[PDB]
Design an enzyme around this catalytic site. Structure first.
Site, short mmCIF file in Angstrom:
data_model
loop_
_atom_site.label_atom_id
_atom_site.label_comp_id
_atom_site.label_asym_id
_atom_site.label_seq_id
_atom_site.Cartn_x
_atom_site.Cartn_y
_atom_site.Cartn_z
N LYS A 3 -14.95 8.48 -3.37
CA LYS A 3 -16.18 8.81 -2.66
C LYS A 3 -16.77 10.11 -3.20
CE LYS A 3 -14.07 6.64 1.32
NZ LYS A 3 -13.35 7.09 2.50
N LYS A 10 -8.76 14.32 4.69
CA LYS A 10 -7.91 13.14 4.65
C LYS A 10 -6.87 13.39 5.74
CE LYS A 10 -6.88 14.57 0.53
NZ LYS A 10 -7.01 13.36 -0.33
N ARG A 11 -6.05 12.39 6.05
CA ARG A 11 -5.04 12.60 7.08
C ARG A 11 -4.09 13.73 6.65
NH1 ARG A 11 -4.52 8.66 11.24
NH2 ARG A 11 -2.69 9.96 11.77
N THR A 45 -8.90 6.79 -1.99
CA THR A 45 -10.25 6.24 -2.04
C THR A 45 -11.22 7.38 -1.70
OG1 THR A 45 -10.01 5.39 0.24
CG2 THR A 45 -9.63 3.84 -1.59
N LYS A 52 0.37 14.86 0.92
CA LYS A 52 -1.02 15.05 0.48
C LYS A 52 -1.24 16.54 0.19
CE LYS A 52 -2.94 11.02 3.00
NZ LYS A 52 -3.77 10.35 1.93
N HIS A 63 0.79 -1.24 0.00
CA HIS A 63 0.00 0.00 0.00
C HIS A 63 0.80 1.27 0.00
CE1 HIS A 63 -3.88 -1.93 1.07
NE2 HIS A 63 -3.11 -2.76 1.77
C1 LIG Z 1 -11.95 7.31 2.93
C2 LIG Z 1 -11.32 7.88 4.07
C3 LIG Z 1 -9.93 8.13 4.11
C4 LIG Z 1 -8.99 7.92 2.87
O1 LIG Z 1 -9.09 9.16 2.13
P1 LIG Z 1 -7.89 9.68 1.08
O2 LIG Z 1 -8.39 11.06 0.69
O3 LIG Z 1 -7.90 8.66 0.03
O4 LIG Z 1 -6.63 9.72 1.82
C5 LIG Z 1 -9.36 8.60 5.28
N1 LIG Z 1 -10.12 8.83 6.41
C6 LIG Z 1 -11.50 8.60 6.41
C7 LIG Z 1 -12.31 8.89 7.70
C8 LIG Z 1 -12.11 8.13 5.27
O5 LIG Z 1 -13.49 7.83 5.30
C1 LIG Z 2 0.45 2.76 4.11
C2 LIG Z 2 -0.91 3.30 3.73
O1 LIG Z 2 -1.70 3.63 4.62
N1 LIG Z 2 -1.19 3.39 2.39
C3 LIG Z 2 -2.45 3.96 1.94
O2 LIG Z 2 -3.30 2.86 1.49
C4 LIG Z 2 -4.56 3.20 0.84
C5 LIG Z 2 -5.31 1.90 0.54
O3 LIG Z 2 -4.61 1.13 -0.45
C6 LIG Z 2 -4.25 4.04 -0.44
O4 LIG Z 2 -5.45 4.40 -1.16
C7 LIG Z 2 -3.44 5.31 -0.07
O5 LIG Z 2 -3.09 6.01 -1.27
C8 LIG Z 2 -2.16 4.94 0.77
O6 LIG Z 2 -1.52 6.11 1.25
#
Ligand SMILES: *Cc1c(COP(=O)(O)O)cnc(C)c1O
Ligand SMILES: CC(=O)N[C@@H]1O[C@H](CO)[C@@H](O)[C@H](O)[C@H]1O
Ligand SMILES: O=C(N[C@@H](Cc1ccccc1)C(=O)N1CC(C(=O)O)C1)c1cc2cc(Cl)ccc2[nH]1
Ligand SMILES: O=C(N[C@@H](Cc1ccccc1)C(=O)N1CC(C(=O)O)C1)c1cc2cc(Cl)ccc2[nH]1
Ligand SMILES: O=C(N[C@@H](Cc1ccccc1)C(=O)N1CC(C(=O)O)C1)c1cc2cc(Cl)ccc2[nH]1
Ligand SMILES: *Cc1c(COP(=O)(O)O)cnc(C)c1O
Ligand SMILES: CC(=O)N[C@@H]1O[C@H](CO)[C@@H](O)[C@H](O)[C@H]1O
Ligand SMILES: O=c1[nH]c(=O)c2[nH]c(=O)[nH]c2[nH]1
Ligand SMILES: O=c1[nH]c(=O)c2[nH]c(=O)[nH]c2[nH]1
Lengths: 793, 77, 793, 69
Positions: free
Chosen positions: A642, A530-531, A638, A536, A339
């Site tokens: 969404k 996102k985090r 992901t 990012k 990942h």
């Molecule tokens: C889907 C989701 C993420 C992953 O989001 P990215 O923008 O792809 O990093 C992280 N935290 C929560 C609470 C989510 O529902």
């Molecule tokens: C180590 C880790 O948390 N990797 C994370 O995994 C998700 C699910 O595959 C990816 O969508 C994302 O880009 C990536 O940063």
């Protein structure tokens, strides 16, 4: 399950289960009474489903992960069981508000972000596809910390999610298992023995995973650590030490912290899981030769890497199988999902730590590696550096184990989570391994469940879509392409825009009651949740925000499309730059939101405590989705999926799955900008000098100087010094390098936004092309090309 | 009437005899759950420890204390 | 100060001070014995506090006002001195009821309403903040009249508040001062002399102002008029004429009556105050250059405007300072607070009256104006109309002095009492002055003391809050925001609602014993108490009441949330419309309360003799606070703040501080309705035709026709003719224009009321956000931005 | 105390609605804690508080062994 009967069951639980009447019952009591009323509907099918797996013995899939970012369960359960409308009516007739009861439920935040949420979506898709699948993880007493903002800074509060009870979990005493740590090894004439170990018990808790409208209810088994029962007071208190193993989730997203306790959690979940898996296999109405045809274990990243040497330990030391055979069945059992490719996220455990804690596993790992290198030395006699590169062991000073290498040799399939990502994993990072074994490396593009991320979070949209093309799309999201037929349907475009508007009003109410700010309901909701990560780049976003503020300060009367810019996410506790960026954003928002000249033109919100249940609220209300990682840094993403599914347009880089989103919807239908992977490489070689852009771009300079001179922190003019320093001299995510293209792109977004019909037409093109991103399709590919398992429709 | 006490996680130890001597084991009586107790979340209260006394014109106050919450569990009699 | 000793002191006073034993003592005697017992506790700290001001000479603040609406003193004193519980015990052990003794005390009703109550709250906050502050006013022999209702009409009875003695006041003979009136002026070669004047002596009476729990006891100095001692009988009787100056308070709220006696009171309080201030300065262990650094005088509205030319008279004619210097020190000494923008309330004294009574002051005023216009003519040579607009003199026919203009040029700071109000004062009403002097105009949002308006009037609430978050909130009300932590605390919400219930039972007992009516203790207490004004619109409220009655008469069985509607307040004696509105309400209440069909569904009460001690009773028992002035008419309001602090929800317009209450608590947590300031303006331009709404709204027509046809006054069918006429043809407060939105809002209130948990949650959100409204915060801002004085904590 | 305040019952009647039995000296701290509540929080005068306290509490002695004290 009819209205009258649900009210009766609700009243029955309130009485016998919560010991209350309508006069003394609390809101929490009502939530619990409803939760139990709904829960009873799962029982019959949960027992039947697990019973059917035993009788028919289909090959089972075990998804092993240290994370399961589940969010709330009440609504999800009602929806997948087709109970929501009736429950909504029942509760209403009882004089209550089901949405208020729903808010009492704590998120099961047993994850950090995407990696953990992918696991959660996967369980939903697997139960919906009717696969005999199990999720195996750790029942953390505390999940991802609750985030508070104090004086503009992130503060962490413990997420005591089990304090009031979890009606969704079931203790399974009869399946408790002992896990061993430390000790020593003895190579006797009756096999090698791992002795004088410390023992910690693993008590499993099962949570049902209902499929969408199919009678299937699978299981999520999470293990909880307990001290075994063979200064007295201190001895009893010390039982806490063993129990700390499942105490709290490590809050790092894409970062490796080599803490011994983390290593303990990793072996804990792996030892308990595999022993439980073998136990079930041995009780199955199935020698072990058929094991791989009855069991598939997916490694969610390298976190459960120890499962490989643990399975071998069980087979060799316990089941007395010869190494060769054990090894064969092992590779056929495991498949690994990589990942990430960020250096600092790589799991590399020091050999000394592993030797002390897991002596028998270290031995087995060395053996694995030996048979590994001997084969390479054979095929490539001269290449000495190749052996160094493919070794499971890094001997460069502080000797450590490369867990990804161990996952590669112990698995029959390795996959990335997005085409561009899987390519880089196969051809760059693991070239030596893929050249040696071509067919081992695969791609499996990520996906999200359309139950939780559409039906549940945006019923207005799910309903509007269903009216146009039926409900088949729920179980086959590729059916959304039929939506293409309505591209010139004016009334439909108006209906689509109304759904977004209502979502926006609903969420604007959430914002105003949660924050000071007055929300312009008609402004464009520009969102980045996102985090918090330097890669990012919510920092780049912050530069754009300051840029927009200055434009307003200069030309107060220029026609400006009003925006509500929302940025939220948790920063890992020890991630300094992440915490500084949050403080920057809150500082910026305070100036912007309180400057008389901008007023309702621009509002900025740092969304607090971003988590699954909050994503379900903000995503449906979004117009512009920020997916701006530096090309090559986001393996897939992901959240991007969404937003696409929920009617937002995307502004992003050609990174992770953003690339496939562009392929499906047409690149012109996304606001792609900035450096692509090749541009990043080239700029690297040449050498990146941040100063150039700063000097070369006037709007950027003003932004930078303002942050640097205290404009956004009067009382502490040098507060953002570290941010400035990183930006000019240590930014490996090239923020300034994409600033120009990013801002130019943002202006084009505002341009389109002024054209409601053009804007909603592109939205429709995105929604209509989002079908590929359902986790049902991702799981079908995993079932077909890796696990070799089949559904039941 | 009401009984008020502490809900110990471990009661009086289980006693075993090893080589003729008493040996103690933790009485983990809540491991499998206690159907006879009923958590009463809405009545949780804060309890103070340590800290210092401040003698003010507004009236002596106990300040800077460490706090521990008390969650009551009712068992029917 | 312990129980045993208080009983002894009580017995000692009953004996030596009241000359009674337990057999012959009256209730009044007991009240007095307790009053003296408590009073003795103030002495030590009153002497020390005033002694400390002399030794350390901190800059002093003088709050000059013709009004100090103090209410009762016994309880307030016990509370601020931490003596209440002990006194309560002592009295109880003596076999008496302290609450019954407390009712003997007369209110010191030396004010009309908000303006006067603001002064009273300010003295409490200033003593609590430890500032060297003094209140200076007039010791009226009669305060605001006692209101009686006879045959449904208001009748006035003299408020002979000193008849039995005031233990809370101290005669200060040694500080008597002569005040001059009439006479003539002589411009001699030894300075100008004001001669052949009539002399009236000013005898000062000091009342202690105890701070809340801090050893500080400040002073309220009120002046009493006395005839000087150089047909005999008639000559002695005529001494009454001079003494009439401090005889009675003018009973007008927001209305200017240009009576010569009023002008006499104004100069009386101003002359005595300033001479007393200068005397103290000259005796201070301090040339006059330091005067402004040792003295700050706040003008409570324009009533004490003459203080400006009086200070100049003293400096020039007496202290022999040159005009220029006198003027400089003067501006630096005074600050002015504008409390209103209603045309009819503007103080504009005819020049001829001022010339006859205060010849030297007229001269000085003309000079001030001359130097005033000469400067404008300079900066704006052409603008002739600007000079006309900024002149202290209005020459349009009957020449008069614009006192607000005189306050503006003689003060270094001018402030409004609510943001919206201060804005209008700065940018509209006084634009010419603020453009000329930007930094002079400020805002200082009103506040109320949380001692009297929380601790004192609602101990149950103060106690409940203290149990949750401590007592720090008493001295820092912004601490109430911590209450936010309990929004989901069910048990706390129940405790909150119980406190309101108990307050309601207690007050329902007051109502039933004072009026015929039987009170539904569970009905919603809908309250509107404040002075009767067309702009405050208790008339609109009356329309809503009649509306509710008709709904009941039509659908007797429709689910109706029962209400007890209370409306009270005094009307100025010569205010005809105000008196007619009262008669309307009493007439409406008589029908409603005696119609068999409505019964316990709706009860209406016109609360008689609304005053400070009665506000303390009704406010804590209130569920819905009526703050419905027409947008732009209520400068701030403070009753609105009292209800917020005590657990009532507010239904009001976006006017005065209602706007900031909405900002603090969240607009969704108040029942805001009707036209905002811009809507009023727009409707003005277009022209307001009352008929439209009447014809356009059926429920309104029935109401109107009923009032007009005698339904509510059978024996005098045309009794309400003037009300009807004003409503259709001369209503400048647009009653019909807000009727619709008002009634729609009222229905939403009833809706929420049916949801106890939702209702109390919003109440908690109001209480938790009421912190800004403490007068301690208002005083901090006055001390910091205007007086430049500092506390002592 | 919370239950007393919520009842349909000042504190004068507290000992008439409340009886607390001290099982041995283990919960002895309850005496000064009630005083602390009455005095520091409820602001009752010491005398009054002490009187109420004595009427509320009753103490049961379960041992005379010196090592048990
Ligand atoms: C889907 C989701 C993420 C992953 O989001 P990215 O923008 O792809 O990093 C992280 N935290 C929560 C609470 C989510 O529902
Ligand atoms: C180590 C880790 O948390 N990797 C994370 O995994 C998700 C699910 O595959 C990816 O969508 C994302 O880009 C990536 O940063
Ligand atoms: O615990 C009971 N019901 C349960 C009901 C429940 C179960 C699972 C999740 C939430 C609620 C309860 O209230 N909780 C379990 C939680 C915990 O472990 O803290 C809180 C219960 C009902 C009952 C009825 C009688 Cl008569 C006596 C004892 C009783 N306990
Ligand atoms: O925990 C459930 N029932 C409870 C029943 C119970 C309650 C109290 C004491 C003993 C048993 C349960 O099994 N336990 C609570 C104990 C603990 O705290 O560990 C063990 C439960 C029923 C159920 C049904 C579905 Cl469909 C899903 C999850 C479920 N959990
Ligand atoms: O006036 C006395 N006590 C005072 C006590 C008092 C003082 C101030 C306010 C209320 C009561 C008295 O009764 N009044 C002053 C009021 C007034 O001015 O009308 C009424 C007093 C006590 C006494 C004792 C003897 Cl032996 C002779 C004469 C006495 N007068
Ligand atoms: C506070 C108060 C007022 C001012 O009330 P508004 O509703 O702001 O006009 C008037 N009279 C009395 C007796 C008060 O206590
Ligand atoms: C002239 C006058 O009495 N003005 C009154 O002053 C008080 C105190 O500032 C305000 O709250 C109120 O709205 C206003 O009507
Ligand atoms: O403690 C950390 N956690 C992280 O997630 C992280 N990421 C990073 O770059 N540094 C750190 N540090
Ligand atoms: O005598 C009056 N007093 C007032 O307060 C008033 N207000 C008003 O409009 N008219 C009058 N008349």
């Amino acid at each position: 399950e009819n209205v009258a009967e649900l009210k009766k069951s609700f009243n029955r639980h309130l009485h016998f289960t919560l010991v209350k009447d309508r006069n003394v019952a609390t809101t929490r009591d009502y939530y619990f009474a409803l939760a139990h009323t709904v829960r009873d509907h799962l029982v019959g099918r949960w027992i039947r489903t697990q019973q059917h797996y035993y009788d028919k013995c289909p090959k089972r899939v075990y998804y092993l992960s240290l994370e399961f970012y589940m969010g709330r369960t009440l609504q999800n359960t009602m929806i997948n069981l087709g109970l929501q409308n009736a429950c909504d009516e029942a509760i209403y007739q009882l004089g209550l508000d089901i949405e208020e009861l729903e808010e009492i439920e704590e998120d099961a935040g047993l994850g950090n972000g995407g990696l953990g949420r992918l696991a959660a979506c996967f369980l939903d898709s697997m139960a919906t596809l009717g696969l005999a699948a199990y999720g195996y993880g750790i029942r953390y007493e505390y999940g991802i910390f609750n985030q508070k903002i104090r004086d503009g800074w992130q503060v962490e509060e413990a997420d005591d999610w089990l304090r009031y009870g979890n009606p969704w979990e079931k203790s399974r005493p009869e399946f408790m298992l002992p896990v061993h740590f430390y000790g020593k090894v003895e190579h006797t004439n009756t096999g090698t023995k791992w002795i004088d170990t410390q023992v910690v018990l693993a008590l499993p808790y099962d949570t049902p995973v209902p499929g969408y409208m199919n009678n299937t209810v699978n299981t999520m088994r999470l293990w909880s650590a307990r001290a075994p029962n063979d200064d007295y007071i201190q001895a009893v208190l010390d039982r806490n030490l063993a129990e700390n193993i499942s105490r709290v989730l490590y809050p790092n997203d894409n970062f490796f912290e080599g803490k011994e306790l983390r290593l303990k959690q990793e072996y804990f979940v792996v030892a308990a899981t595999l022993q439980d898996i073998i136990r079930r296999f041995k009780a199955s109405k199935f020698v072990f030769d058929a094991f791989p045809d009855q069991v598939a274990i997916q490694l969610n990243d390298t976190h459960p890497a120890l499962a490989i040497p643990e399975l071998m330990r069980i087979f060799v030391d316990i089941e007395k199988l010869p190494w060769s055979k054990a090894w064969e069945l092992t590779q056929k059992t495991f498949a690994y999902t990589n990942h990430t490719v960020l250096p600092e996220a790589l799991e590399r455990w020091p050999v000394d730590l592993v030797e002390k804690l897991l002596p028998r596993h270290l031995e087995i790992i060395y053996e694995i590696n030996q048979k590994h290198l001997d084969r390479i030395v054979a095929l490539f006699p001269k290449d000495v550096d190749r052996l160094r590169r493919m070794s499971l062991i890094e001997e460069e000073g502080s000797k450590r184990i490369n867990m990804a290498h161990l996952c590669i040799v112990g698995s029959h399939a390795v996959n990335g989570v997005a085409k561009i990502h899987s390519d880089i994993v196969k051809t760059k990072v693991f070239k030596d391994f893929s050249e040696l074994e071509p067919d081992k490396f695969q791609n499996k593009t990520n996906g999200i469940t359309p139950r939780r991320w559409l039906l549940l979070c945006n019923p207005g949209l799910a309903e509007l879509i269903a009216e146009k093309i039926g409900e088949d799309y729920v179980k086959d999201l590729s059916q959304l392409t039929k939506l293409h037929s309505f591209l010139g349907d004016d009334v439909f475009l108006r209906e689509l825009a109304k759904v977004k508007q209502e979502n926006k009003l609903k969420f604007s109410q959430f914002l105003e009651t949660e924050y000071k700010v007055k929300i312009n309901p008609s402004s464009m909701f520009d969102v980045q949740v996102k985090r918090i990560h330097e890669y990012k780049r919510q920092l780049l976003n912050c530069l754009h925000v300051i840029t927009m503020y200055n434009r307003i300060k200069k030309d107060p009367k220029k026609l400006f499309v009003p925006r509500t810019v929302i940025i939220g996410g948790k920063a890992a506790p020890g991630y300094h730059m992440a915490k500084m960026i949050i403080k920057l954003i809150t500082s910026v928002a305070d100036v912007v939101n309180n400057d008389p000249m901008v007023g309702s033109k621009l509002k900025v919100i740092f969304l607090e405590n971003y988590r699954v249940s909050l994503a379900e609220k903000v995503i449906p209300a979004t117009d512009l989705s920020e997916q701006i990682s530096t090309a090559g840094t986001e393996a897939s993403g992901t959240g991007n999926m969404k937003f696409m599914l929920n009617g937002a347009l995307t502004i992003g880089t050609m990174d992770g799955a953003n690339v496939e989103m562009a392929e499906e919807a047409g690149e012109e239908n996304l606001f792609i900008f900035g450096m692509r992977i090749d541009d990043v490489a080239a700029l690297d070689k040449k050498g990146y000098e941040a100063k150039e852009y700063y000097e070369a771009l006037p709007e950027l300079k003003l932004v930078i100087d303002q942050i640097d001179n205290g404009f956004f922190s009067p009382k502490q003019p040098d507060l953002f010094k570290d941010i400035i320093n990183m930006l000019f001299y240590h930014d490996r995510f090239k923020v300034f390098a994409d600033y120009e293209a990013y801002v130019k792109c943002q202006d084009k977004v505002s341009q389109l936004y002024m054209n409601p019909k053009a804007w909603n037409t592109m939205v429709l093109k995105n929604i209509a092309a989002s079908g590929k991103f359902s986790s049902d399709r991702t799981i079908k590919e995993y079932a077909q090309n890796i696990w070799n398992v089949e559904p039941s429709d």
